[PDB]
Amino acid sequence: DKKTTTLLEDRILTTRNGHTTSTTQSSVGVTYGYATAEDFVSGPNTSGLETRVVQAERFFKTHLFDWVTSDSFGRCHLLELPTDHKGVYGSLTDSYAYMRNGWDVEVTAVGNQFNGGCLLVAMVPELCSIQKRELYQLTLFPHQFINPRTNMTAHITVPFVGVNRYDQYKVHKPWTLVVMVVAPLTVNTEGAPQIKVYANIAPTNVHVAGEFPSKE
């Protein structure tokens, strides 16, 4: 871990997105995928009419799946982004025709340090499905592992990507969060019996353009 008994030291990381914070005492750092900053947000396709909506840049949550001893190598859970959102970010998709944002992603798999096994968490662009042999190369994508003896949290941050500078999220999902079982979960005598996997995600640098009419 490179730090120092229980989950600790410079392994304590607090992330803040808007008026929401998340702290973990077993951080293994943050993986920045493909870039450490967004490319230009004001290009010719929006004619200077885009605006940033800071109120949407905050954490929202979802359950992913329950990791059990019967899952074997290659078992995956895929979550396309953006996903259903019932807060401010979600209302933006019904109010503007074009949008772009990156993602700050935290995935946790809380069991205890007596469990064994390993999960690979990755952010993959343009992914609807993947073949079994391709899973052996999932590390080509921005990723981090969750290995119970070391950590319970994975954190990946990625920018907006796409053939277009702004997107129409109702018809295209640029990113897919994938969690894959690398080595099966072991419980032994003292480990947690199963591990529920959850995601805490925040949209970043949210820009919108093209206001829609109301339904009224």
């Binding site: 190369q137 994975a154 990507v161």
Partner: protein, 188 residues
Amino acid sequence: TTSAGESADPVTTTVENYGGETQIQRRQHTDVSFIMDRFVKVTPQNQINILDLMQVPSHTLVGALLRASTYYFSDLEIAVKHEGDLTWVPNGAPEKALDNTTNPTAYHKAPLTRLALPYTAPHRVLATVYNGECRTLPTSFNYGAIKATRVTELLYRMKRAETYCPRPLLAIHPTEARHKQKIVAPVK
């Protein structure tokens, strides 16, 4: 060396760890622009052929390396064996335009026609995969189209290629411990 394996930070040890010496490497052959810059054959349609790099078979050198990238950009050269004159129209053109010869039309000259064409898509880059329908790529992902009375051979060549976001690149899955093949060798 040991390290925290959970982090994606790359670790690249060297033979110096046990007393060896790292040598010099010359990697010109794995440069993206160089490796993609060569012709590859596709099977053509009789008359109208949409210029779409996804037609390059996935097992070929160019087809496999192209698919190992998510987004890409390039200009293009094509070499075509055809009967009659060959007309090309840019991305976005109505298909009927292929019958009008004011659009770039190369008059037949044996044994084939070779042309340099610019990228003409309305997007900043194209993609080899696109998560819209969750197969099918948007109709705008193309380099135009060509038409001749009969097209019998068509080769594509990517120029000034750029690739972004690597994707899996797979070798053959062997049945035995090692994939063995007949290698060229002086005769008997």
